[model samples]
Target chain A: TLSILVAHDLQRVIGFENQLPWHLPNDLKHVKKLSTGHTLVMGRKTFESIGKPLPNRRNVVLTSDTSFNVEGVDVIHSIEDIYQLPGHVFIFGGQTLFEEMIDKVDDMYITVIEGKFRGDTFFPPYTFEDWEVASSVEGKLDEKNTIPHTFLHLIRK
Target chain B: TLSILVAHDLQRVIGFENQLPWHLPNDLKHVKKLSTGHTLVMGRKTFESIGKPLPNRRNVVLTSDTSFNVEGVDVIHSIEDIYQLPGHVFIFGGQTLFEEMIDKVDDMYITVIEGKFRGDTFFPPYTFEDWEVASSVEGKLDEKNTIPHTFLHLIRK
Candidate 1:
């Protein structure tokens, strides 16, 4: 099964300056909890932005340049390469990769941060017609965050 | 039959400073097209915002202020009053009115405006579990408008 995990502001912006634009401890925890035991197929830029492999997750990077290499990470030239791997996998992202794999994923874990944001990258726009909200937990204002949010687990309908 | 018609930004915000923040001519045209030859049920503030009866539609304003009166319009203190009316009736909003009638609406005509907005009022968020997109028409960018939008016709599943 393939799933995706992302956190975006109301504008559907996911990043700015090549990094996460906001610091919500709960959102960070949410991502870690969901992706920890799965295979993370991401873009090269996202791998570089994070600097290193996320602990406990099998990191697979897709890049056009085969020369790109990182210790303890598998580098590949196309997104299709990840499909051959053994267990459940996730399309971890930085905008472009998410856009590339959105249609192939069966589930989506979305953190809907409630506020406008200034950003350079955005999640691709999509209609909810193909997905159903399986569960939702409304987030609250935290001293560590700028806005309230909702965590949604959506399954393809 | 009950229906809902609304215009919302990417964040699903409907109003700002108690008025629509963006000037979209087509959005108004869309609302008028659907609500014509039908009964419109709206909240007190939404009725007050418009300031008069909408032409060709039976305007029913739901408000606690029973003394409120407008020529050629019905003023009722409770939401239940319009249930007995004949033919199709729509929940025309203000967030308060939409919240009150969301469960009763069998169909929704939603205009999704693209881009971020500055707003104080929002359309009440709801999971799409019980609704399905029966049809959708992609909106075009008018030279006079700043954003592209989509019109969605949703029906109870």
Candidate 2:
């Protein structure tokens, strides 16, 4: 019953000068509603993506180093510990965590931005055979970028 | 055996003077190692938390707004499409996504910080009947702050 959700775009809706800040449309808000008081798993970079602890949820940080610790965040070493939670654990990734958790994911959150980008990063292709599209929608993106995106819900067989 | 990991801490990890930048440590190197060439998922707050896209990683951002895009990140709006990635995956988070993904995780990446924090956000409980502690390291945290912390590693059952 675990769910795996991923939302991304090649062009950053964030700024690197301070913190990488971004805004989400309707679908992402859904994820927030569901994830409240639950848990999120991420890699060190993915953990860094937020730059701080999220409010109302648990953060399990995956890292190789044991030297760092957020005031309230729990930094972890491996991916095996995610099973201890009682419900479905969703993975919001930076890139590698998506790749790491991709195999075992049951459900998904895909936000489609309506254009190709000229940037260094990208979204992994959601082309697995076990997955089926559950839903999708087309809409205008936030003010961070000019492209339009679609949000899709998927699940694995 | 893919996993979703979220790491966070509340309190002023950084200043929002919009003048001071959010800080990231060598964890990016760890993120580079773990999430590189993989798909990353995150909530809008976590997505907005980054200062830049980590090199060699695929970024999937979750959100409610659709008109925004970034140079190095991917944007999405659903919770069921992450199953499409080829390898492992991670979920970077803010409080909203962490709460949403709690029941959906198969494994957990938990770190038991040995330190006590006067923080706003907190560590989620990893007391699941199906979870396991595959590995762990117990040591004093670095002298980064006034308090010291230890680490605990866990996995899914």
Candidate 3:
């Protein structure tokens, strides 16, 4: 199965200055839990933002530059290449990659953080009218996570 | 007292074309409950979007077009004029108006609808770091209101 995993503020902002705008350890835990044993696909910039391959998961970078290569990463030139990957695949992101693969994913894991944020990168605009909410869990606001948030699981109808 | 009242989707979308993207009667009721017997300030486009002055409130339209005039609608040529209005004032909107007045409002009443939506207009981007959530109420999903929502009241700290 192919899935898209993302977290964004109320304005759909996902990144600021190439980094996450907020620190939410629970969201980090959620990402690790789901993508740990799966193949992770992302844009070249997203991979570059991380600096190194995330351990355990197979990191696949989708890029147009044929010369782009990393020691522990797999590089694919097109979105079609993701479909042939082994096991469950999770689309890890930068905005462009998510925009390219949004319609092809079977399901989506989205964390909607409450309130506006300062960010330059936004999640692709989409009206998920053809999708159904499978489940939802509200995140608690505590010392480490000061923002109110909700995690939603959506499946294509 | 000056305040802002708005409803937006997870993407901070407030409008599609010139109208709201979704119909939520409860949100309408919430707006009515707060704005009745008060003064409402809006931009020319927002006033045009409503077609006519909303009942039971003093309608104030902020516009750069000095020639713009309407029956029962008070027109102001500058943002400075809003401060001179008497009684509780609510900044009603179009995107540009909201962007200009966001920082000046003492409080905000925002309804955040669940999920993404198709829209061309968005609420102004703001990080409420200097504000505190005064109260929040969750909106129920029912036959008329199918989307989940949350009503948040934020006061500047």
Best by lDDT: 3
Backbone clash total for model 1 is: 0
Tens-place lDDT digits, model 1, residues B1-157: 8998899888888998879866777788888889899899888888878898899989988888857877989888777787887788988898988887788889999888764566888888877798899988877544444345789998988
C-alpha lDDT of residue B148 in model 2 = 19
**Cα deviation of B41 in candidate 1 (Å)?**
0.7
Q: Which segments of model 3 are wrong by more than 4 Å?
A: A1-157
What is candidate 2's lDDT per residue for B1-157, written digit by digit as tens? 3466543222212113222122223333344666677777777665555657667878878877888688888777887766665576776554555566756766545433221222344335445576777766433323222121123345666
Share of native interface contacts recovered by each model: 0.00, 0.00, 0.00
After superposition, which runs of candidate 1 have C-alpha atoms over 4 Å from their true positions?
Answer: A1-157
| Ranking of models by TM-score | 3, 1, 2
Score each candidate by Cα lDDT. 0.82, 0.57, 0.87
TM-score of each: 0.52, 0.43, 0.52
Candidate rank order under DockQ: 3, 1, 2
- Report clashes for each candidate as comma-separated counts: 0, 117, 0
Worst 10 residues of 3 chain A by lDDT: A140-149
lDDT of 3 by residue, A45-134 (tens): 888889899988999999999899799899999988998999989998989988988888999999997756668999887676978999
Q: What is the lDDT ranking, best to worst?
A: 3, 1, 2
Model-by-model DockQ, in order: 0.03, 0.01, 0.03
Candidate 1 local Cα displacement, residue A113, angstroms: 17
What C-alpha lDDT, on a 0 to 100 scale, does residue A105 get in candidate 2? Answer: 76
